[PDB]
């Protein structure tokens, strides 16, 4: 919806934004559902006047009679009149006294010490570390070869335990379309399967499109077979410079005649005559007796199609077997004494990484206290003891006198250290909104936590508002 609130307010004498409160009422809305990233206004450009000249910016003033603001999501308390109108309101992200007004539903707060919220510091980045990572797969041994087989006799390349590196597959030398049966062209390295069956051969370019589920022809009936639900891809490229003789390579054959169809991934490589008609040849090879395999007859000077086009298949499968071929993403660097979202081979936690004095045995990868909590983790490719330290969470109190006697407050950050993080209270890192206190003036330290906004006095007065560990705050006259 695009609801538009409205209230004509001519009570103003002309002053820019007079101090007060009012209520707004809406009128209409309608749906569009469009992404928007530009805001502009349109004038009655045929009549322009009262436009002065200036160069004001960065919190200055210059006569415009226009006002622009950008709204934000806030929690916000209202007061309803007995008639029903709105008489007063506060927001819970401005000042500690406002948050105190919000934690207990009233417009007045009395003397004492309260509780508002926590101030847990957020992480800065994320890091991932993996095994040394290597023993990768020699997939280059497939494409880079001079012994490419035939369609009626192909090679079966099964990939054993290694690391699946697909960087040289789509990013390097992508001669033709990927022709992915079922896989993400971008997420090739992300998800991995058990084993890959690779076959290399040559067919006609016009017959290259025949390599797809549910497609038949001269090569998909007896020579080569594919499952309908095949997963993986096929890579094709020109090979005119590979196999092109003066007369052309005739050693490549294709099956054309057979008694029945072909089972999925079956090789019927054989040399026998075909029983055509009523001539059961027993070596005659004469009338109605021909060899099912027919010479391809390569032509170096011919155009597309008949030119050597080599296709290598990748038969993926997802079977309930241990992972064999998988390529993980490269492990990032390491940080110390910085709150980050560390990940160590399936150990995604947040906190601070520091060097540990422990002496893990050669078969130790975790570490625990008696809490069922992860304590120390060994680096997968540095072989040392990396200790784990949590974040710097803690609560926030607020010390105030009566709201109708004073308006200034002091905030106690219990269980933390002003030498630690909260002194550098900054936007987008600390949940509390007010990053406005200098955190260098009127800063004091106490066993229960460091206190902001009060000055230690070496007098001795009876306790008014207890704090803890003997320190007792109070309002006073200087």
């Amino acid at each position, epitope marked *: 919806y695009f609801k538009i609130y409205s209230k004509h307010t001519p009570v103003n004498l002309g002053r820019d934004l007079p101090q007060g409160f009012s209520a707004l009422e809406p009128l209409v809305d309608l749906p569009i559902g469009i992404n928007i990233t530009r805001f502009q206004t349109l004038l009655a450009l045929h009549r322009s006047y009262l436009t002065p000249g200036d160069s004001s910016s960065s919190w200055t003033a210059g006569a415009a009679a226009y006002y622009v603001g950008y709204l934000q999501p806030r929690t916000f308390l209202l007061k309803y009149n007995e008639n029903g109108t709105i008489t007063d309101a506060v927001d819970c992200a401005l000042d500690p006294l406002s948050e105190t007004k919000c934690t207990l539903k009233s417009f007045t707060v009395e003397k004492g010490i309260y509780q508002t919220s926590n101030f847990r510091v957020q992480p800065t980045e994320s890091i991932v570390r993996f095994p040394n990572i*290597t*023993n*990768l*797969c*020699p997939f*280059h*041994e497939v494409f*880079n*070869a*001079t*012994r490419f087989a035939s369609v009626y006799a192909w090679n079966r*390349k099964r990939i054993s335990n290694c690391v699946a590196d697909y960087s040289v597959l789509y990013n390097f030398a992508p001669f033709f379309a990927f022709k992915c049966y079922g896989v993400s062209p971008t997420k090739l390295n992300d998800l991995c399967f058990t084993n890959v069956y690779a076959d290399s051969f040559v067919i006609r370019g016009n017959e290259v499109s025949q390599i797809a589920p549910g497609q038949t022809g001269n090569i998909a009936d007896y020579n080569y077979k594919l499952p309908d639900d095949f997963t993986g891809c096929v890579i094709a490229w020109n090979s005119n*410079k*590979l*196999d*092109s*003789k*003066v007369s052309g390579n005739y050693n490549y054959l294709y099956r054309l005649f057979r008694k029945s169809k072909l089972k999925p991934f079956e090789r019927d490589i054989s040399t026998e005559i075909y029983q055509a008609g009523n001539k059961p040849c027993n070596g005659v090879a004469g009338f109605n007796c021909y060899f099912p395999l027919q010479s391809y007859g390569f032509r170096p000077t011919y155009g597309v199609g008949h030119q050597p086009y080599r296709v290598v298949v990748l038969s993926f499968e997802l079977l309930h077997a241990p992972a064999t071929v998988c390529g993980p993403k490269k492990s990032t660097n390491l940080v110390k004494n910085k709150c980050v979202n560390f990940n160590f081979n399936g150990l995604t936690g947040t906190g601070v990484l520091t060097e540990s004095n422990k002496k893990f045995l050669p078969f130790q990868q975790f570490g625990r206290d008696i809490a069922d909590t992860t304590d120390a983790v060994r680096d997968p490719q540095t072989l040392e003891i990396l200790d784990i330290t949590p974040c710097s969470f803690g609560g926030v109190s607020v010390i105030t006198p009566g709201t109708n006697t004073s308006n200034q407050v002091a905030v106690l950050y219990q269980g933390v250290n002003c030498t630690e993080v909260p002194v550098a209270i900054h936007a987008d890192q600390l949940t509390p909104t007010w990053r406005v206190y200098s955190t260098g003036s009127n800063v004091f330290q106490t066993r229960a936590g460091c206190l902001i906004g009060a000055e230690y006095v070496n007098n001795s007065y009876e306790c008014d508002i207890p704090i803890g560990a003997g320190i007792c705050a109070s309002y006073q006259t200087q």
Partner: antibody
Amino acid sequence: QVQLVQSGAEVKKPGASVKVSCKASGYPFTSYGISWVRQAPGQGLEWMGWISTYNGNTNYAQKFQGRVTMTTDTSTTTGYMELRRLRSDDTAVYYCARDYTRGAWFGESLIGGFDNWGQGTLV
Amino acid sequence: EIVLTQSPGTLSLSPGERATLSCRASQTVSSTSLAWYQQKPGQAPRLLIYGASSRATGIPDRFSGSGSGTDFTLTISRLEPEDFAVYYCQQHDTSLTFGGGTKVEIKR
């Protein structure tokens, strides 16, 4: 980035054995075969040695068949020739290279040659 | 064994002229089986071309490959006078062999 290093010059007498070292770093020592050639003034290079990395399969040349033996260390990625049957004037330089003609896993004929070489040893 | 017959005995020509390197096959070499090796005086050998003319280490405009089928050769245009390197050609169809050899002098 590739760092191939070798030992220094040596002097050896006939009847003993000469040891030659070639250390490799910067590239994965699992998928590239190790080749060893001999170069001397007045002639070109040879095909004295060829070893893989996954297995201990050898491709020694027919000229020096049964007379060359070299070990391969995957931890330090080092080729160690322990050449025997020393002869009086076998003084020539030896070069270790990362082959790109036969793979270290299957071993078919690749498209390439000795793109990366070592620094050489003198005996 | 099959060896390659090379007859560039000496290219006694000044730098900046067209140069021809011969790698005539003995009986038969595949189209996709060729390697070119560079050897500057007192340096480690290095591969130049892993095929006919496809570049491996830079090769801005000098080293080129030509031919097809059984016969092949190398063409040099606008040679830079510093190199004066030794060029070898290698076949891959039968084990691993090197060429006869090539010498290029100063040509003052």
